[PDB]
């Protein structure tokens, strides 16, 4: 068993390394199924050369919306989960990693189906926070996702490999993904189908 | 559909920004219905040339009361629910943003209806806090919102409006806002009646 | 009605501020009942000449104790709540506050009684955290209360007054207290009584 | 009954201290039952010489995984509970305490026996942060934990004495370890056991 983290605390990820350079998101999102869970989920690389601490993850849904008593939101902002409530947002940032919204009743896209999904006019917003260790400073590294940006029924290529006793990051899969089977109803739509 | 945050993470708000001047808060709070729900809200604008990072909102009460003790408390200090628990309270400040408080059991104006509200002396105390991109350090920007400055069924005027590939922000509207059909029932009062 | 904050921010406390010196605890603490509850509370100060953003409020039991089976465990520590779960740790300090914890079922306190606590060898560890404004790095200032320090059955004199549109401290009664009429049973016994 | 903290804040550890020198983590980590649950735990020093200011703890749990539709993650992180509900993981870091993970139905140990756990492929990613209140800069040290380095049915060596008024650490035995009656059942099973 390969340790990823030695006992004083250097992890074994990019031989050689020094632990600017921006930080970098995937480029989609996929939505696929993840034990039985409708999953959103998009990729968040490292730094290559410092790690980031108290580092932690949010999204933002934006989207126009008008209230039951017709008051019209341009861009509304709405928190969508990504490990808030059980701490998994406080990310360990030492290798790229695929965070996982969970679609569930609390979850804006609960009863957004496949065909529906390009129909609405939406963009998660990403966004990670924390402290540059090297520079002492917070930063904040921002990305997008608007419809055409997620692709359903897909998943994210692994990037990462064990070569002679550290772990190598292909930078070059970061991005790519590849598709799975996948329904094509809706979370709120398996929910009900199931639930009988 | 126009884009409000870019791949590399700068944002399309404020044409030609560059990403001292001291942040504002409405003047005003209103209270109206969004979704069934009565809610205190107030507005919170953004820095026009800054980005504020691990951005929060929160308010305080401060209201005098005796407890059925008898101990009387001067100015004492409550906190009113504005996104806590599911992390709409951490801001992605990019423009102007109404800051909203469900006014539920929870809630201090869980009873007060609109004719009780000119009658009760009390003081909702707001506070933005974050880390300013550019200074490196952290800011507090306050204001308070006392009794004849909270207006009962009104709404906030939007400001923001997408022009040629940038959404730019109505900055004489900020504090502006409307009427609205409102009941003038209590929360609490609207709640007993629905709920038969 | 005068306001506490005024619309800019600035509060209306200490007439001809400012906005080393150390921030201070009151010398003991109290038990007392408020709303029907039994409580114990401190009471925490401000700084004369600068705001503490981001000030929160965490208090620790220090208490030796033995696993049922067996394991002694020297001067355990263990979270006593002082508003996690509300947020009403998250401090506005412009001017001394009484911190409240109260005794409920998973209060460390719920079965001591008034006779009882006298005999308990603990100590209430108070820790007050936050980044000072003008300094722009983060203090922390500390206290403790041993069982001797804990006056069952007492109440904080207010401090606390309003003067020509200003509200200046008496900093002498500050750690001042008075007593009031309060059971002797403990809150769990509080808690059996009154339920039948 | 001898102070652990003086009414000025000042903490009564190490004689004649001054409140670099890098933290340190138990090289092994033990499983054995506090009050009736099986609880992971692992020790975690102070600073000689310096306070840590807002210090909190975590652990990652990194374990590869298949999820129920073949999607397979190399090195899974999951977030292991060490009082992030209960502010429990908020540390008062002023001598060696033992953090305890309690593994209950949420905790991935659930099902992991004593037979059982030499044979899984993990690895406990344990990660302490807060701000020198020397240095005024933000630390973080991490240390780990693989399966040969979990010690099943064994209790840390109590490392705390009082002497003189002060509390002295025997940093000897701080990585000691000793053995105690501990059930060989995983908790899971416990759990059902218990409950007929
Ligand atoms: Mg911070």
């Known amino acids: 068993i390969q340790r990823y983290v030695r006992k004083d605390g250097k992890c074994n ?40 601490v108290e580092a932690s993850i949010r999204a933002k849904l934006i989207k126009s919306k008008q209230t039951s008593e017709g008051e019209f939101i341009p861009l509304n902002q709405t928190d969508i989960n990504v490990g808030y409530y059980t701490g998994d947002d406080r990310l360990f940032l ?10 569930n009743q609390q979850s804006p896209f609960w009863e957004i189906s496949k065909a529906q999904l390009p129909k609405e006019e939406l963009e ?12 002492g400073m917070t930063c904040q590294a921002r990305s997008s ?44 739509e398996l929910a009900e189908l199931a639930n009988r």
Chains 1, 2, 3, 4 share one sequence.
């Open 13 to 52: 990820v990019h031989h050689g390394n020094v632990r600017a350079e921006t930080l970098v998101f995937s480029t989609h999102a996929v939505i696929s199924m993840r034990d039985g869970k409708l999953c959103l989920m998009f990729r968040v690389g490292d730094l290559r050369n410092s790690h980031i």
């Open 124 to 135: 998660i917003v990403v966004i990670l926070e924390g402290m540059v260790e090297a520079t």
């Open 145 to 188: 996702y608007i419809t055409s940006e997620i692709l359903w029924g897909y998943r994210f290529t692994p990037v990462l490999t064990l070569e002679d006793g550290f772990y190598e990051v292909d930078y070059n899969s970061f991005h790519e993904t590849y598709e799975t089977s996948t329904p094509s109803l809706s979370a709120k």
């Open 94 to 103: 030492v290798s790229p990693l695929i965070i996982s919204h969970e679609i």
